[PDB]
């Protein structure tokens, strides 16, 4: 998969749209139950004064405090409804019994719930076995004896994972995200990936990049009873694979040169990644939804604003009647440089001076009063105002698709629609009603 990213900068709306990114949208979750076999050990009647026995004593006290804290949290979006439903189903009496029966001899098993859902199961940690077989026997009677420092060190190391799990759940109040390493190890995550009910393409894609999956997954709390701590991990699946996806970097373009004192501007409301889903283009407004890795983007349809297929008409012709666009219309003149994948827009405006830069050639270009565009070839740093923005070092088929600014068509007598964030047709309605205001004002004056 060669990284053939082709960005095309536009001078019409001064929005640069990348291309060549093969995305992978997520349409659902896969809830699996992960159980830690806790042990409810009563306060031992040990009166030893040795350092090792004492250390085992505060470690057991820490374990008991962690268990009590877990019970304390157990007392009280689609991001968590599947896990919540699984927890509620597992709260039914007998489901824990079936889970333990299935996992009696195997660390992995498939259990069918009462309502019909079949969930994969794991046994990441075995604290009950280790405790009842090592700590309880020797440290049982009135005489206390622990002669192995290896034993206490091993107990510290193993109980550490439970301690971090309790800490993360306490701070995050029962639901954690992203899936930390402590909750599910990389090897265990890979093993669960291999057992997923999907084809080999999705399995290979989700195996290649595992940190992305960790970022997009979740973790819940269900129940601590019958000496079992079960937390459901909501790993995702990707129904659509390698769909053509494109970023839509935008930048505020302000008036022709700079009219001294005040004037308009029109940046493009919609930014972030776009993707094609079953003939309808998906849209992601938030930056934290879609994550980039190499030449392929990973997204999340949790709050994706599904759009029709005519979205691509916005880029090539903003004033197309086949599709409806949108542009935030403001009045603030700030020089900015939206860094893109294979370039950098620069809206040098007003008094501030902006110049391209190179480490070896020094300053090689000087901007003007317009949203100009600078390629990544021959440029490594862009200096705008008082700050310096690094220009990506990636190589791609850059295309300066120039045109004319859309500002010139707007009426120069007045520039209405201050601080507006609606569709372009609505902005046409706004300019229409503002010039209706002005025509009725002047006709009333003439009638007077």
């Amino acid at each position, epitope marked *: 998969s060669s990284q053939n990213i082709t960005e095309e900068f536009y001078q019409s709306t001064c929005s640069a749209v990348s291309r060549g990114y093969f995305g992978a949208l997520r349409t659902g979750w896969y809830t699996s139950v992960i159980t830690i076999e806790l042990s*409810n050990i*009563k306060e031992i009647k040990c009166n030893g004064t040795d350092t090792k026995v004492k250390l085992i004593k505060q470690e057991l006290d820490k374990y008991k405090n962690a268990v009590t804290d877990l019970q304390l949290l157990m007392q009280n979006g689609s991001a968590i409804c599947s896990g919540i439903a699984v927890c509620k189903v597992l709260h039914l*009496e*007998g489901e*824990v*019994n*079936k889970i*333990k*029966n*299935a996992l*009696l*001899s195997t660390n992995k098993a498939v259990v*069918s719930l*009462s309502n019909g859902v079949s969930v994969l199961t794991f046994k990441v940690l075995d604290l009950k076995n280790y405790i009842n077989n090592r700590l309880l026997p020797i440290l049982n009677q009135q005489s206390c004896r622990i002669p192995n420092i290896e034993t206490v060190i091993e107990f510290q190391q193993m109980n550490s994972r439970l301690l971090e799990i309790t800490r993360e759940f306490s701070v995050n109040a029962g639901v954690t995200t992203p899936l930390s390493t402590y909750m599910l190890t990389n090897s265990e995550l890979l093993s669960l990936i291999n057992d997923m009910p999907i084809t080999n393409d999705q399995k290979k894609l989700m195996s290649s990049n595992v940190q992305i999956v960790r970022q997009q997954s979740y973790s819940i709390m269900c129940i601590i*009873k*019958e*000496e079992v701590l079960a937390y459901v991990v909501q790993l995702p699946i990707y129904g659509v694979i390698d769909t053509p996806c494109w970023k839509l970097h935008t930048s505020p373009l302000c008036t022709t040169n700079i009219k001294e004192g005040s004037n308009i501007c029109l940046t493009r409301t919609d930014r972030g990644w776009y993707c094609d889903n079953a003939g309808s283009v998906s849209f992601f407004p938030q930056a934290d939804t879609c994550k980039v890795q190499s030449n392929r983007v990973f997204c999340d349809t949790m709050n994706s604003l599904t759009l029709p297929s005519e979205v691509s008409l916005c880029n090539t012709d903003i004033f197309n009647s086949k599709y409806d666009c949108k542009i935030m219309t403001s009045k603030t003149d700030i020089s900015s440089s939206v860094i893109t994948s294979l370039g950098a827009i620069v809206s040098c405006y007003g008094k501030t001076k902006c110049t391209a830069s190179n480490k070896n050639r020094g300053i090689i270009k000087t901007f003007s009063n317009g949203c100009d565009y600078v390629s990544n070839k021959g440029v490594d740093t862009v200096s705008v105002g008082n700050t310096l923005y690094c220009v990506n070092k990636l190589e791609g088929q850059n295309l300066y698709v120039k045109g004319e600014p859309i500002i010139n068509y707007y009426d120069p007598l007045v520039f209405p629609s201050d601080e507006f964030d609606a569709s372009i047709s609505q902005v046409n309605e706004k300019i229409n009603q503002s010039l209706a205001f002005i025509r009725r004002s002047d006709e009333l004056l003439s009638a007077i």
Partner: antibody
Amino acid sequence: QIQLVQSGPELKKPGASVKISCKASGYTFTDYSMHWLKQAPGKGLKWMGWITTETGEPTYADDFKGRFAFSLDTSASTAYLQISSLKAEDTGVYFCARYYYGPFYWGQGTLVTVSS
Amino acid sequence: DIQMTQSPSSLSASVGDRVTITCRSSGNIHNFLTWYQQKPGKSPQFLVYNAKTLADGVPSRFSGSGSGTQFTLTISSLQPEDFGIYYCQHFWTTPYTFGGGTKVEIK
């Protein structure tokens, strides 16, 4: 090493109340729930229902609704069944059970006899 | 409710017989079946955790197999210390139903 101990046998008359108690020792009583079973004389084994040893909300099988009720005292680690409005069909044995790695685990039986 | 019945209601075998007991279910249960060994005038105990996992402390002669609706035990060799009434009971969901009782005897 988990031992469940029940009460003793009784011989009484219809219309009165029977108190049969099971005490659980060997584990913390909060988590594991208490389950009650019926044995008819010579027939198979019925299933009453369950009483949760954490909150105290029981659920009853449709056959055994109306006359039977279990209550528990978590402080004493004992759960007892009160059987009011005794019928002649009450003859049989009573069992207290819990979920131990799959199937149930029942303690010793308590013969109940109904005279006239 | 899932009703469970046993075909050999009354069984009588010799000391060296390989006896077989089957249980049926009205519905489909993924394993979730166990048996009990009722001694006369005592409290029965389990011997097979699931359809194919024998319990600890049970002689290896006992063992089981089957999934879905048909389930069946396997006894390698009868031993006179083993005698009583055998029942089978699922734990798929409440309510909980037992069988008719396999009253094994000695020929």
